[PDB]
Amino acid sequence: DETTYNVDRSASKKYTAPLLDTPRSVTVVPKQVIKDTAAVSLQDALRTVPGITFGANPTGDRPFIRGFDAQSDTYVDGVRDTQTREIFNLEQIEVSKGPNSAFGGSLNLVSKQAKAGNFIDGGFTYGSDQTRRYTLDLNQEFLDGNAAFRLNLLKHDANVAGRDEVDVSRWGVAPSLTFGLGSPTRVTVSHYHLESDDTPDSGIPYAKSSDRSKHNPDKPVNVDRGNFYGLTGRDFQKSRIDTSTITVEHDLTDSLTIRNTSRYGNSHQDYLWTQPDDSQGNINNGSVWRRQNNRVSTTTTAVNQTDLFGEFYLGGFKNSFSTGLEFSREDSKRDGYIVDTNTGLGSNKCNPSLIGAPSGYNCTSLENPNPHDPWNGSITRKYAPLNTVGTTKAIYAFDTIDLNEQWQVNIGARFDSFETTAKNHGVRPATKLSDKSSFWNWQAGLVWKPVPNGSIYASYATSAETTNYELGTKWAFFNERLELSAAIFRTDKDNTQSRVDGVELSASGKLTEKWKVFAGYSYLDSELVSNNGNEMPNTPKNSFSLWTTYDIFPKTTIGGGAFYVDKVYGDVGNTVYVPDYWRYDAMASYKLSKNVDFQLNVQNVFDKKYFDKAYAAHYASQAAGRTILFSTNFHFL
């Protein structure tokens, strides 16, 4: 069933048990939720899972999970990645909220692969924000059903509702080949390519009060909804990602599969954007310094991962296990631009008399900025990069033991070894600095099943310094079409000292035959333990996500979502924040025939102005306003 709102198993076979019986908080955002919400990105899609905030970049692509930074815990099919992620090539999104030695929490993005079946799918979406999105998803068998070819294509252009001039443009191509369908030896080859060229948002500056502190923190200034402080003549955000993956699987016995995966990745970023005022206090006289930020970056990644997984029997118990070796190499080159933003008054100071041409357009108006100002300062590349070469070697082992039909034990360990060399051409003479380290990690879980469709679990994880305790329960109702979850947990971290205590509730699947739900609640009580007693940044204390659809007639579905996010602090010092908000979404779909769907989405039904990322200083990112999307989807199977 491809229309399910509940997914009962992970895709990666490092999990040794179904999700009901896995002793960890895991939420899968299934394909159908991604389609029903009409999500056009990873962040858009993750609004359905509460307590995941993004922070920091001209668009902050760094997730925070249970109040902890997870930029370098994003996986594509269980392997690390070389950046703003699109969803056209994804089947589902797997969110692990606590640790998992198999890989603060992590995201695992499952790619669409060539597989058995013949289909041609495609869609176009037109929007009130000028969205023009075209997708094609073609999968064809060949070699008489022993192999398959799949091609996913994307073209996406859009403005942003309630933001002057800000826009996005991207396209993608994802070819895939799989061989040995149904046989004991399978070979898969994938390539992924995405290129983008955006006009980056400036965001909105924090108010800057004379008495700003932990006690009276500042929030974004209140100005017209569309205000953009950047420059259409200057600012740009260009990226390219290329990823090749080769996977070989062989069944050695009926109980044992060996798997080798090779990934080569290559990503370029060339960004230059504006930040409003960088806390210079010019906003208090009605003006804004257009501070310039930038990054030029190239990264190369090479990974090889060999896994052995399956079953063995010992003392009368089944042991469902996975074990492996991982070797990788990352090359990164960080450079930038040198840009003249001198206002003429102490470099970065402004007032209304300097707005426009007297500041070389480095000052603008707080209330009525002009993004078309013909700014014309020098831009030159530094050509003096920080070049880093990193090596990793890891070994891991995971085992689930069925003691009887009521009791299971999970144990997992992982050892990582790391070597880096950094050459910095930004200082004279250039420096060469090396570093060596390792990371031990292990976890244990206990599952009690009073009845088959019921689960109560304890869990302990440590890494060496971090410690996680979790205690939870999961239940499957209405013929295992509805999963309910509840968890409590504590995370303790030394040399961050910090603590996060929390509660998580989930509901996923069918309530009745016509009524589906995908929903969660998250409570995060976080603390630094002077900043002693402050909340963690990017960690909403309360959040709630509800997505629901109802099959109101045959051929017709209606639906909506309600999302709450509590206030969020930008800094450890708790001096800046973005306020809490409610957002509501609506949808309707009509099956015109077996081959054509029509879909309407209304995002942010009440046109709430709110801020989806709070940065540590200077400013916050404003989310999109009300957006209306009409989709036409074709599918021939």
Residue numbers in the entry: 27 to 82, 87 to 112, 115 to 135, 142 to 502, 531 to 562, 576 to 608, 625 to 732
The authors write:
Here, we determined the structure of PiuD from strain 39016, which shows 99.6% amino acid identity with PiuD (PALES_48941) from LESB58. The obtained PiuD structure was similar to that of PiuA from PAO1. The crystallographic asymmetric unit has two monomers (denoted A and B). PiuD comprised two domains, a 22-stranded transmembrane β-barrel and an N-terminal plug domain (residues 27 to 156) folded inside the barrel. The plug domain has two β-sheets and two α-helices, which together, occluded the central pore. As often occurs in the TBDR structures, some of the extracellular loops were not experimentally located in the PiuD structure. In the B monomer, these regions, namely, NL1 (83 and 84), NL3 (113 and 114), the loop 138 to 141 of the plug domain, L7 (504 to 530), L8 (564 to 572), and L9 (609 to 624), were presumed to be disordered. As a consequence of the disorder, one side of the extracellular β-barrel was absent. The closest structural relatives were PiuA of A. baumannii (root mean square deviation [RMSD] of 1.1 Å over 701 residues) and P. aeruginosa (1.1 Å over 656 residues) and the pyochelin receptor FptA from P. aeruginosa (1.8 Å over 655 residues). Like PiuA, PiuD also has a distinctive cluster of aromatic and positively charged residues located inside the pore at the extracellular face.
